[PDB]
Amino acid sequence: MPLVYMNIIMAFAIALAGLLMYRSHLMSSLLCLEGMMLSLFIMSTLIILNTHFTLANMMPIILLVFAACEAALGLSLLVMVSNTYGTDYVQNLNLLQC
Amino acid sequence: MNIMLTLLTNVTLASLLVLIAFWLPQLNAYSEKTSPYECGFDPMGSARLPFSMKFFLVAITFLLFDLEIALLLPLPWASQTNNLKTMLTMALFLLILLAASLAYEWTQKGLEWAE
Amino acid sequence: PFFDVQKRLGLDLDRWMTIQSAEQPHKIPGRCHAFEKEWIECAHGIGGIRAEKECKIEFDDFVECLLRQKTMKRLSAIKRQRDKLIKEGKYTPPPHHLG
Amino acid sequence: PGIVELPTLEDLKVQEVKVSSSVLKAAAHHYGAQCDKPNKEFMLCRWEEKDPRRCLEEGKLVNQCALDFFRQIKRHCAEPFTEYWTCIDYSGLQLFRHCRKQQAKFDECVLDKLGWVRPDLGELSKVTKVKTDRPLPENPYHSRARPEPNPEAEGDLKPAKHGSRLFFWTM
Amino acid sequence: MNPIIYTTLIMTVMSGTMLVMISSHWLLIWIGFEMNLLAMIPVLMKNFNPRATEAATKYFLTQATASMMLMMAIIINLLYSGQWTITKMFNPVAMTMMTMALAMKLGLSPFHFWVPEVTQGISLQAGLLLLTWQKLAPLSVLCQISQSINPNLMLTMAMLSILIGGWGGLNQTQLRKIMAYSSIAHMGWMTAVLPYNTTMTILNLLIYITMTLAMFMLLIHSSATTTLSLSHTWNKMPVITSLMMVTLLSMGGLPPLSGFMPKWMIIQEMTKNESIIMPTLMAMTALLNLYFYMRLAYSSSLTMFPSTNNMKMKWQFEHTKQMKLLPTMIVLSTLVLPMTPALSSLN
Amino acid sequence: MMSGRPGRVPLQFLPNEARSLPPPKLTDPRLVYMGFLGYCSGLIDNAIRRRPVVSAGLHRQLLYVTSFVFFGYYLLKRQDYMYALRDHDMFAYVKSHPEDFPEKDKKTYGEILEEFHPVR
Amino acid sequence: AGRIASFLKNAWAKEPVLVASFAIGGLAIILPSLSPYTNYAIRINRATPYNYPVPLRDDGNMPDVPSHPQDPQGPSLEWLKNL
Amino acid sequence: MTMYIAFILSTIFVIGFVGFSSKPSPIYGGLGLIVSGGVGCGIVLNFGGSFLGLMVFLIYLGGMLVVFGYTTAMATEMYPEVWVSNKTVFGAFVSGLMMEFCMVYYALKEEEVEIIFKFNGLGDWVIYDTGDSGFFSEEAMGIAALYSYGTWLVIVTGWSLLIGVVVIMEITRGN
C-alpha cells in the first residue's frame, strides 16, 4: 500500500479528529465533516481507477451526490440554530439539558 | 509538465503584477486614511455583523440543483450506448425530476426569494 | 441481504456492479478479472466458513493482484540492494538500463 | 511458488517492422485484407492460450507476412503510397477524410497491379473463423481442482419429533 | 407540515430502511442510511421549537459522523478485497470501524449520549418513530455481518449499553428520557446476543418494538411528558393507566408477561454456548430497569395522586384521535409467552 | 438454528414441501389459545374507547378473533415446518457423519462403580 | 372544451415561457417512441467496433460465420452506407 | 526532480488538510480545504481520472462556495476569528506537520511503516498498470454506464434529491 494511500487515509484520520474534536464552531466542524467526504472521495476514486473497476467508476459521483446533500441540510440546520441563538458557537447550545 | 508549466507561468506572472502593484508606489502612511468608507461617511459599526438574510434558500437550492447537474453531466458519453431506449427513458427521468424539484420550489414559495 | 427481493421476484437491482468480473461496459475487464473469476467459481455453493479455507490460495493471490503488496515489497528489496552496492560501487547497469 | 518460463533472448528476436504510424494507417485496409490469416490466428492464440509465451511463433508469422506485404507494395506503386502516407502524416489525427484524392491514386495501383480491393465499410470488421492445428487450451487459467460441493441432502419431511422440544412445550 | 408532505416523509424514511434490509451492494446500504437520515430530520422538526432544533442538530451531527465512518469501513474492505457484497469482512479494522459506525446510529456504547437528549427534544410521536423504526436498519446490517464481528467488542459494547441504560434512567422524571434509557438497555439486550445467533436478537427486536408502540401510544393517549403529569392522569383515564401499569410490568420481564420471553431466550442460548458469567450481569442489571419501572407504576396507578380542580372539566371531553392498533398492540406485548415456539418461524 | 439453507426461496411464508407435514388441527390447543388471544384484543378495545367492554360491537370482536386465529394457523404450519427441518437435516447430518457420533456402549448399573455418599 | 382552449390561450399569454417549455418537453418524451429511426440509432451504436472482433476457432459447420474478412456472408451494414 | 510529484501531490494534500481541520477561522478552514481539493484533483488526474477530477473540481468549488455563503451570513460576528487568534491552533498545526513527516521519514528509511496497516515507502508510480484503452477512456465510459446499468442508482438518487429539496423547504420554512 503506497504513500498516496497513507496520505489520504491519514488526511481522513485528522479530518475525523478535527470535526469530532470540536473546538468552538459548528460551521467549521461541518466544514471538517465535508472535507472528510472529500478525503473518502479521493480514496475511493484511487482503487476504482487502479483496478479497472469500470462500473464502480460511477460510484464516486454517486457517493458525492448524497454527501453534499448532508451538508445541504447541515448548513441549513446551521441557520435555524443561528437566527434564534445568534451564532454557531456551540457552547450556548445548551438549552436541551434535561 | 506542459499543463503544469502553464499554470506555474500564470500564477507567477499574476504574483509579479500584484508585487509591483503593492510595492512600487509610495505612501505617506498617515492615520486618518484608515477610516473606512460609505458614500462619504464610514460604515458606522457594521460591515461584519451577522447578515439577516432571506435568499439563503436560493443559495442552498443552487447546490441541490448542482448535484443533479453533476448527475446529468455524463450524458455525451452516455448517448454512445447499445441500449439507447433505457438511457433515453432514464435521462428523461432525471430532467423530469429536475423540473419537478423546480416546480415544488416554485409553488411552495421556495425559489420565490423570501421576504 | 436480509430480505433478498432480488432473486425472489427475479431481477438484478444492484448485483450488476457488486463484483468486477461481471459484464463491464464494452467488455472492459478489471485488473484482476482472472483472479476473481478463479476465486468466485472456487467458492460457489460451499459456505463462507468452509470456502474461506479451501479457496485460500486463490484469495491471497487475488488480494496480491489487487494491492501488489508482496510484489512491490520484492521490488523495494531489489532496489535497496541495487542502490547499496552501486553506492559502494561494484558493477554498472547495462546499456539497456541507460539508453 | 514456481519461477519463470521466459523464452531466451534469442527466441523473441524478430525483425521488428520499423515503419511510421502514418505509413501503417495508410496501408491499413489493404494490409488487413491481404494479411488477415496470420493476424487472425495469432490473436486467436492470444485469446485462447491467454499466454504470449505460447504464441511467439504466431508473432513471427504475422511479422514476416506483413513484411512480405510491405515488400510487394514497395515493388509496385510506392510514390502514390508515399504521397498518401505523407498526406495522412500532415493530419494531426491521421484523418482519412482529407486524403481522398491520393486515396484513389493509391487504391487503383494495388487494384490493377497487385489485384487488391479496398475493403468496404464494416467489411473488415465482422468476426471471422480460422483453423489452427494447435490443441485446445484445456485449462487456460491453469485452475486447480474445484472444491467439492456441500453434502446434498434429501428426504421427505417427517413431523418433528416431540414437537418443538423447547423447554416444557409438549408440542 | 402539509399532510401529504408528512406522508411523503413517512414513506421516504420507510423506503430508506427498506433499501437497507433488501439491498446487497454496500453502497446501497449507505444510500438507504442517509435517505433515512435526510428524511427523518424534518419530521423531528415538525413542532419547530428550539428544543426540537437542538435534538435535530445533535441527531444530524451524530448520524452524519456515523455514516461517514460507515463509508470508511466500506472503502477499507473494498480496498482489501475489491468486493462490495455485504458478507464477512476481510480486514479486521474495517469490521471494527463499521461496528462503531453502526453503534453510533444505535446508541449502544458511549456513542449513546445523543438518544436521551434527542428524545427529550422532539414530540412523543417523533419519539415513537425514532426509538422504533430507526433501529431496524442498523440491526439488519449487524445481522448480515454476524459472521465476523469481534465477540469481545460486541459483548462489552452491549454491556455498557444495558448498564448506562439502567443507571441513566434512575435520575430521570421526563417520560421521554426514561424511555430513551430503557431503549438503550434493550439495545444492549439484543446486541449482546447478536454475535451468537441472530434469530434471538430478531425476536427481542420484535418484542421491544411491540412493547415500544404499546408504550408510546399509551403516553400520547394520556398526553403526558413528566412523571407528575402522568400521575395526574390516574383520574381521567383509569383503564389507560391500568394498562400503563400492566405493560410497565412487561417492561422488566416479570413472568409470565411477554417481556420475560426475550430475556429467557437470550440467557438460554448464551448458556448453550458456555457464556455463563455474561448473562448474569444483564440478569442482575435488569433490576435497574425494574426500579424506575416501579417508580413509574407507583406514580401512575398503584398509588392515587393529587389531581387538580380544573382537571375535572376534562371529564367532559373524550379522546377523539382513535390511535388505532393500540388494543392488539397491548395484547401482543403482554400475553405471548405460551407462544414461545413460534420463534422458529423467524429462523 | 438457518437462513443459508440451500434451495431456500426468500420472502416465502409456507414452502411447498411443508404440506407433507401434518397440518395443525383446528382444535390445536395453541391455536385455540391464540383464538382466545383474539378475545383479549377485542375486550381491551372497548375498554380503551370507554365503550361497554362486555358487548360493544361484536362485529369488531369477530374480526379480532377470526384474524388472530387465522394468522395463528399459518404461523403454526411454519412453526412445525422449521422444527421439522431442524429435525430433518438433524438425522441427515448424523447419518452422513457416523464418526462424529460414536455408538456409545451401554453398561448396566451392575458393571459401573458409582460410589454412594453417606448423607448424615 | 371552451375552458381548456381559454386556459391554453391565457397560458400562452400570461406565462408564454411556461407553455413553450412544457410543449417542447412534452414532445421530447413522446417523439422518440413514435419516431421510426431510433432502432436505426441502436444499429449505429452496435455497428461501431470499439474492440477487436476476436475470431472463433474453426471446426466445421458454421456456414454463417465468414471464413475470410473479405467473404460475402456475415453481418453487413450497407444500410449504414445508404443512411 | 519532478519524479516525486505524484507523492507530493498527496503530501500537500495532508498538511493543507490539517490547517483545514486545525479549527481556524471558518474561512481559513475553507482555504485549507480548497488547497487540499485543488491538489487532490491532481492526485486523481495523474492516475487517469480526468473526468472525476474535473467533476470534483466543479461541484466541490461550488460546495465550499455555498458553505461560505452562510459564513458571511449566519456565521460571522463583530470580531471574526483569525488564523493566528487562538494559541492552540498553532499546536494543532505543528502536530499536523510532524506526524506524517516522521512516518514518511521512516518509510524512506525502513519502507515497512507499522502504523495501522501495511505500507511501503517505494513511491506510487509502481502501482499503475500496463495496457491500453483503444479509442475510449475507461473512466468516462464507466461513468456513462450510469444510464444503462445504473438502473437503481439514478432512481434512488433522483428520489433522494427530490426529498432533499422537500426537507430543505420544510426545515427552513419558518412556520
Report the Cα–Cα distance between both ends of chain A, in Å, rounded: 48
- Concatenated DSSP letters for H42-101? HHHHTTT-HHHHHHHHHHHHHHHHHHHHHHTTTS--SS---TTTSSHHHHHHHHHHHHHH
> Could you tell me which residues are beta bridge partners of residue E25?
E85
Q: CB burial class (10 A; 0-12, 13-18, 19+) of residue E227?
A: buried
Q: Which residues contact B79 (CB under 8 A, 6 or more apart)?
A: B87
Cell output for H36: 487540499
Cell output for H63: 460546495
How far is Cα B62 from Cα H62, in angstroms, rounded to an integer? 9
Q: CB burial class (10 A; 0-12, 13-18, 19+) of residue F12?
A: exposed
Domain coverage including residue H43: 5-173
Q: What is the CATH number of the domain that holds H125?
A: 1.20.120.1200
How far is Cα B88 from Cα B90, in angstroms, rounded to an integer? 6
Report the Cα–Cα distance between both ends of chain E, in Å, rounded: 41
Over its C-alpha atoms, chain C yields an Rg (Å, rounded) of 22
Q: Do residues E210 and E188 make contact, with C-beta atoms less than 8 angstroms apart?
A: no
Domain coverage including residue B90: 1-108
> Could you tell me which residues are beta bridge partners of residue A25?
A89
Q: What is the CATH number of the domain that holds A81?
A: 1.10.287.3510
How far, in whole angstroms, is CA F115 from its chain's centroid? 42
| Cis bond upstream, residue G55 (ω within 30) | no
Is residue B114 in a domain? no
Q: What are phi and psi of H160, to 5 degrees?
A: -70, -40
The owner of cell 448453550 is: E272
> Could you tell me which residues are beta bridge partners of residue E85?
E25
Over its C-alpha atoms, chain B yields an Rg (Å, rounded) of 25
How far is Cα B31 from Cα B42, in angstroms, rounded to an integer? 15
Cell output for H57: 473540481
How far is Cα A3 from Cα A14, in angstroms, rounded to an integer? 16
CA-based nearest residue to E176, from E139, E138, E212? E212
CB–CB contact G51 H134 (8 Å): yes
Q: Do residues E132 and E206 make contact, with C-beta atoms less than 8 angstroms apart?
A: no
How far is Cα F60 from Cα E136, in angstroms, rounded to an integer? 31
G30 touches chain B (CB under 8 A): no
The owner of cell 516522521 is: H102
Q: What are phi and psi of A89, to 5 degrees?
A: -60, 110
Is residue B31 in a domain? yes
Cross-chain CB nearest to H122 (options C13, C26, C72): C72
The owner of cell 523464452 is: D7
Q: Do residues G28 and B98 make contact, with C-beta atoms less than 8 angstroms apart?
A: no
Any idea what DSSP says for residue C20?
T
Q: Do residues E168 and E153 make contact, with C-beta atoms less than 8 angstroms apart?
A: no
Beta-carbon pairs below 8 A across chains C and E: 55
CB–CB contact B91 H147 (8 Å): yes
Q: Give the CA count within 13 Å in the CB-facing half-sphere of E94.
A: 21
Q: Which residues contact C42 (CB under 8 A, 6 or more apart)?
A: C51, C54, C55, C58, D146, D147
Our count of domains for chain B comes to 1
Report the Cα–Cα distance between both ends of chain C, in Å, rounded: 57
How far is Cα A48 from Cα E84, in angstroms, rounded to an integer? 12
Q: How many CB atoms lie within 10 A of CB H57?
A: 16
Residue E58 with chain A: CB contacts under 8 Å? 96
Q: Do residues E302 and E245 make contact, with C-beta atoms less than 8 angstroms apart?
A: yes
Q: Do residues D25 and D92 make contact, with C-beta atoms less than 8 angstroms apart?
A: no
The owner of cell 480548497 is: H34
* Amino acid, res. F71: F
Q: Which residues contact E276 (CB under 8 A, 6 or more apart)?
A: E270
* Amino acid, res. C44: H
Beta-carbon pairs below 8 A across chains G and H: 4
CA-based nearest residue to E202, from E261, E251, E255, E284? E261
How far is Cα F10 from Cα C9, in angstroms, rounded to an integer? 9
Q: How many CB atoms lie within 10 A of CB E265?
A: 22
Distance from the F114 Cα atom to the nearest Cα atom in chain D, whole angstroms: 29
> Could you tell me which residues are beta bridge partners of residue G56?
D129
Q: Treating both helix axes as pointing N-terminal to C-terminal, what angle do E175-193 and E124-132 enclose, rounded to 10 degrees?
A: 10
Our count of domains for chain A comes to 1
Q: Do residues A28 and H81 make contact, with C-beta atoms less than 8 angstroms apart?
A: no
Instruction: Give the torsion sign (CA, C92, C98, C99, D4).
Output: positive
- Core vs surface per residue D12-21: b (16+ CB within 10 A) or e: eeeeeeeeee
DSSP run (H or E) holding E240: helix E238-252
Q: Which long-range contacts link D74-81 to residues 24+ away (Cβ below 8 Å)?
A: D76/D109, D76/D110, D76/D113, D76/D114, D77/D106, D77/D109, D77/D110, D77/D113, D80/D105, D80/D106, D80/D108, D80/D109, D81/D23, D81/D26, D81/D27, D81/D106
Any idea what DSSP says for residue C38?
H
* Amino acid, res. B17: L
CA-based nearest residue to D76, from D30, D25, D113, D28? D113
Q: Which residues contact E74 (CB under 8 A, 6 or more apart)?
A: E26, E27, E30, E84, E98
Report the Cα–Cα distance between both ends of chain D, in Å, rounded: 59
CA distances from D117 to B90, D37, D95 (A): 45, 17, 20
* Amino acid, res. H33: L
D125 touches chain G (CB under 8 A): yes
Report the SS3 class of residue E282.
helix
- Concatenated DSSP letters for C60-94? HHHHHHHH-HHHHHHHHHHHHHHHHHHHTT-----
A 12-41: CB under 8 A from B: none
Q: Which residues contact D94 (CB under 8 A, 6 or more apart)?
A: D21, D22, D25, D88
How far is Cα G62 from Cα G65, in angstroms, rounded to an integer? 6
How far is Cα H43 from Cα H50, in angstroms, rounded to an integer? 10
How far is Cα H131 from Cα C9, in angstroms, rounded to an integer? 41
B75 touches chain G (CB under 8 A): no
How far is Cα A40 from Cα A47, in angstroms, rounded to an integer? 11
- Concatenated DSSP letters for chain D? --------TTTT--------HHHHHHHHHHHHHHHHHHHHHHHHHHHHH--GGG-HHHHHHHHHHHHHHHHHHHHS--HHHHHHHHHHHHSSS--SGGGHHHHHHHHHHHHHTS---PPPTTGGGS--EE---SPP-S-TT---PPPPPP-------PPPTTTT-STT---
Q: CB burial class (10 A; 0-12, 13-18, 19+) of residue D64?
A: middle
How far is Cα E250 from Cα E262, in angstroms, rounded to an integer? 11
H166 touches chain E (CB under 8 A): yes
Angle in degrees, CA H23, H36, E73, rounded to 5? 80
Report the Cα–Cα distance between both ends of chain G, in Å, rounded: 44
DSSP run (H or E) holding E329: helix E326-332
* Amino acid, res. F78: R
CA distances from B104 to B98, E24, H162 (A): 10, 33, 9
Any idea what DSSP says for residue E171?
T
Altogether, the residues listed in chain E come to a count of 347
Any idea what DSSP says for residue G57?
E
Q: Do residues H38 and H75 make contact, with C-beta atoms less than 8 angstroms apart?
A: no
User: HEC states along B65-115?
Assistant: HHHHHHHHCCHHHHCCCCCHHHHHHHHHHHHHHHHHHHHHHHHCCCCCCCC
* Amino acid, res. A98: C
Any idea what DSSP says for residue E25?
B
Report the SS3 class of residue G13.
helix
* Amino acid, res. C36: E
**Minimum CA–CA partner of D170 in chain E:** E341
Q: CB burial class (10 A; 0-12, 13-18, 19+) of residue E304?
A: exposed
CB–CB contact D129 G65 (8 Å): yes
Cross-chain CB nearest to B77 (options H62, H140, H151): H140
How far is Cα E70 from Cα E29, in angstroms, rounded to an integer? 10
Over its C-alpha atoms, chain F yields an Rg (Å, rounded) of 25
Experimental method: cryo-EM
Q: Do residues C36 and D139 make contact, with C-beta atoms less than 8 angstroms apart?
A: no
> Could you tell me which residues are beta bridge partners of residue B38?
B41
Altogether, the residues listed in chain B come to a count of 115
Q: Which residues contact F56 (CB under 8 A, 6 or more apart)?
A: F46, F49
Residue G50 with chain C: CB contacts under 8 Å? 26
- Concatenated DSSP letters for chain F? --TT-TT--TT-SS-GGGGGSPPPPTT-HHHHHHHHHHHHHHHHHHHHTT--TTTS-HHHHHHHHHHHHHHHHHHHHHHHHHHHHHHHHHHHHHHH-STTS--PPP--TTT--PPP----
How far is Cα E212 from Cα E197, in angstroms, rounded to an integer? 23
The owner of cell 412523543 is: E124
How far is Cα A68 from Cα B64, in angstroms, rounded to an integer? 8
Over its C-alpha atoms, chain H yields an Rg (Å, rounded) of 21
CA-based nearest residue to E23, from E14, E12, E32, E13? E32
CA-based nearest residue to B94, from A62, H157, A66, H52? H157
How far is Cα F9 from Cα F13, in angstroms, rounded to an integer? 9
CB–CB contact E27 A95 (8 Å): no
CB–CB contact H158 B71 (8 Å): yes
Q: What are phi and psi of B50, to 5 degrees?
A: -55, 135
How far is Cα H18 from Cα A16, in angstroms, rounded to an integer? 11
Q: Which residues contact H80 (CB under 8 A, 6 or more apart)?
A: B48, H25, H27
Beta-carbon pairs below 8 A across chains A and B: 26
The owner of cell 491552533 is: H89
H141 touches chain B (CB under 8 A): yes
Q: What are phi and psi of C24, to 5 degrees?
A: -80, 155
Instruction: Give the torsion sign (CA, F24, F28, F32, F37).
Output: negative
Any idea what DSSP says for residue E173?
-
Q: What are phi and psi of E273, to 5 degrees?
A: -110, 35
Q: Do residues H143 and B74 make contact, with C-beta atoms less than 8 angstroms apart?
A: yes
Q: Do residues C68 and H127 make contact, with C-beta atoms less than 8 angstroms apart?
A: yes
Q: Do chains B and G touch (3 or more CB pairs under 8 A)?
A: yes
Any idea what DSSP says for residue E208?
H
How far is Cα A27 from Cα E314, in angstroms, rounded to an integer? 47
DSSP run (H or E) holding G56: strand G56-57
The owner of cell 431481477 is: C11
> Could you tell me which residues are beta bridge partners of residue B39?
B41
Q: What is the CATH number of the domain that holds B20?
A: 1.20.58.1610
C46 touches chain A (CB under 8 A): no
Report the Cα–Cα distance between both ends of chain H, in Å, rounded: 62
How far is Cα H161 from Cα B72, in angstroms, rounded to an integer? 13
Q: How many CB atoms lie within 10 A of CB H116?
A: 12
- Choose from E24, E80, E140 for mutation: most chain C CBs within 10 A: E24
Distance from the H132 Cα atom to the nearest Cα atom in chain B, whole angstroms: 19
Phi and psi based region of residue C18 (left: phi greater than 0; alpha: psi -120 to 50; beta: remaining) = alpha
Is residue B35 in a domain? yes
Q: How many CB atoms lie within 10 A of CB E77?
A: 26
How far, in whole angstroms, is CA H74 from its chain's centroid? 25
Cell output for B34: 484608515
How far is Cα D100 from Cα D102, in angstroms, rounded to an integer? 6
Q: What are phi and psi of H71, to 5 degrees?
A: -65, -40
Q: Do residues E16 and A37 make contact, with C-beta atoms less than 8 angstroms apart?
A: no
How far is Cα A61 from Cα A46, in angstroms, rounded to an integer? 13
Q: Do residues E285 and E162 make contact, with C-beta atoms less than 8 angstroms apart?
A: yes
DSSP run (H or E) holding H161: helix H151-172
Q: What are phi and psi of D129, to 5 degrees?
A: -135, 155
The owner of cell 438503550 is: E184
DSSP run (H or E) holding E333: none
